[PDB]
Amino acid sequence: SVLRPLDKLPGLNTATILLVGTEDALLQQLADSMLKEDCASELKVHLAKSLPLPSSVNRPRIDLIVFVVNLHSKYSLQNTEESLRHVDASFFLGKVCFLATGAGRESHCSIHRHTVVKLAHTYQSPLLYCDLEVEGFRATMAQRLVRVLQICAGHVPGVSALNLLSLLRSSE
Amino acid sequence: GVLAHLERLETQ
């Protein structure tokens, strides 16, 4: 199956986010860090290991997809590269983000940062850096992701996902 | 300083 952006009608003051990654503990920590703080909207978080998802009908529409890449293992990079081929092009227009983990400890890194630099640049998507092991940085990353999700869902008048694509565009 | 005041306001 292929995931599409606009299959189902939006809910009433509800935003949904999807997190794809191999390490479940980090995803769980990021999720309950996002849900720890309150906001004006109703947030829902979905967790997955890879794409495509198991078939279901009750699943609502997805507004943002975040791919978590762990620099300490090539398995996560291979999994993300495989999963990137199961989403349509129309979903890449400002609704996909990349989150790299483990850049702080250089000695443990097994993947060069320049490889994920091409990976992010090829698909025209923003790239973020964070160490999910530390709570102080994880809280800030969760707040930033919540703000980005609120922008993407259309809760901010005058700003859409396409404009956000131009806002975070890199010069080179 | 200004930034110290901003920080001490942000904490509360």
Binding site: L6, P10, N13, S90, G154, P157, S160, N163, S166 | -
Partner: protein, 139 residues
């Protein structure tokens, strides 16, 4: 009671307008160095038209609010509201704000000249000591 429902209706209308606009744009769209120039031209055009529309809407809203407050100047005079405390607080705060602004203006005005004089003195001393050092080294 009705205020909460009215606010919710306004928020839902605002969100639904954006979502409908996005659907319409997607449907309309459904039907290498030379591409970036076109992209940035289009972005500038959208930015300009959005700014103009926002200014027009804000001006109309301010006009409506001003005429609404002017139409009921008497009712907001005798037994007006608890608003009087807020208005007196604003009146008290404004004078202090402007006084602090003037003080900051004067302080920055002095600091600019002091910094300029320091820079000129440093520039002169650099050349003077350089020539002294080169003369001493030559000797």
């Amino acid at each position: 009671c009705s205020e909460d429902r009215m606010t919710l209706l306004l928020r839902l209308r605002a969100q639904t307008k954006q979502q409908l606009l996005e659907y319409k744009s997607m449907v309309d769209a459904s039907e290498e160095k030379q591409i970036e120039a076109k992209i940035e031209d289009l972005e500038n055009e959208i930015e300009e038209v959005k700014v103009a529309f926002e200014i027009k809407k804000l001006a109309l809203d301010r006009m409506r609010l001003s005429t609404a407050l002017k139409k009921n100047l008497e009712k907001i005079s005798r037994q007006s509201s608890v608003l009087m405390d807020n208005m007196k607080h604003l009146l008290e705060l404004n004078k202090l704000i402007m006084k602090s602004q003037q003080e900051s203006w004067d302080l920055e005005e002095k600091l600019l000249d002091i910094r300029k004089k320091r820079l000129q003195l440093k520039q002169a001393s650099e050349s003077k000591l350089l020539e002294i050092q080169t003369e001493k080294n030559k000797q």
